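Dear all,

This email documents one entry for the complex benchmark we are building for the journal club exercise. For each entry we list the sequence lines for every component of the assembly. Then comes the predicted three-dimensional structure of the complex as a token string, followed by one or two observations. Please use this as the template for your own entries, and keep the labels exactly as they appear.
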Amino acid sequence: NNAIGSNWKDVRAELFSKEEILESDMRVAIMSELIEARNEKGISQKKLEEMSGVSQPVIARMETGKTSPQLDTVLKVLASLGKTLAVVPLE
Amino acid sequence: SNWKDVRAELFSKEEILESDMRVAIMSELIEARNEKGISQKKLEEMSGVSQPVIARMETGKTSPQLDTVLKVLASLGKTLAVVPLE
Amino acid sequence: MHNIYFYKDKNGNEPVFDYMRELTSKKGKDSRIKLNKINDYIELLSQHGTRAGEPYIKHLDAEIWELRPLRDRILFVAWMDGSFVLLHHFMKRTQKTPKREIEQAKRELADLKE
Amino acid sequence: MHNIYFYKDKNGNEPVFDYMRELTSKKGKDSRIKLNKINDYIELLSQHGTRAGEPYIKHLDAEIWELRPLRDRILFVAWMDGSFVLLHHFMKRTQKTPKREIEQAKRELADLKERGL
């Protein structure tokens, strides 16, 4: 076409530090487990405040809030979604 | 007796997963201060994390922030990834 | 996995990419919070298409959608096998979507054919 | 890599743990932050052995390993391994801490002795 512009993969990299990328891929990857929960597994997030004892608002800031979670909260949550976090080699 | 077995009896899936995590960050911090030779000030240098925030990482303390944890690891060339059960 | 393209206009400037480097341009934790939130949501649109659901995406009118990071609103469209085009950007001031913004997206989807 | 066993006393009946118990009796975690402790440092063993270990895992004197940040603890390990585990914990004053508990340190290899016959 013409008035069809940059690919995102190129605009992401002109504008973000590879670590601001890495911070994000991860944010994103978490949002992504809560999306599966909602649409695929069928777990309302009120049901996951019960399975994990994390408060409903704490869970939804993983999707909507301005700041990053402390660590445990994420473990707890992923853990009922049946996932953990692992340390792996960078790239 | 055996460790795995009396871990599972004084703990179960529960806070083992926050230990297994805390222990894994301890390792990369230890393995970095020992095997590579990388100091904790030069860790503040490469990562921008307040080194107190770093030192409270290595000790159990209570859990640090997803972000802070990822810059430190980043700059030892490691990251967190999400992975399945068992 | 789903490619995304910024709409370039006639002049040719990408308006959604114009707004982003202006987020970049400035300091303040708020600049970064926004900009991070946006960088999250487009990455989530890229990997998930529209089966992201809410809160990241509402359908609006016809083939115009909104991506919804914090209070920015980014209109995109479905595109070729199968992919999306981010049209332009605006900040929610209302509980009812300004219809003004929607025609401006329709007009941009227009330009996109040719 | 590195399995970690536990030990044998009189009955057998060996206590070790109700340090690890009875903090199970108490209350949430100011009990269990006191002990999420070594679930960390023992876990930290069976991955590392000690390469590393220290800072934290220790030595004071003789034949030697192990342990924590905070109040406290233990001077513990035997050579036929990877594992070890054995004796007790009981706690203190510091920073002196002792010329007498490095013979309630050992007070030990009576343990790695003919107790490992």
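Observations: The two ends of chain D are 25 Å apart (CA to CA). Chains D and C do not touch (no CB pair under 8 Å).
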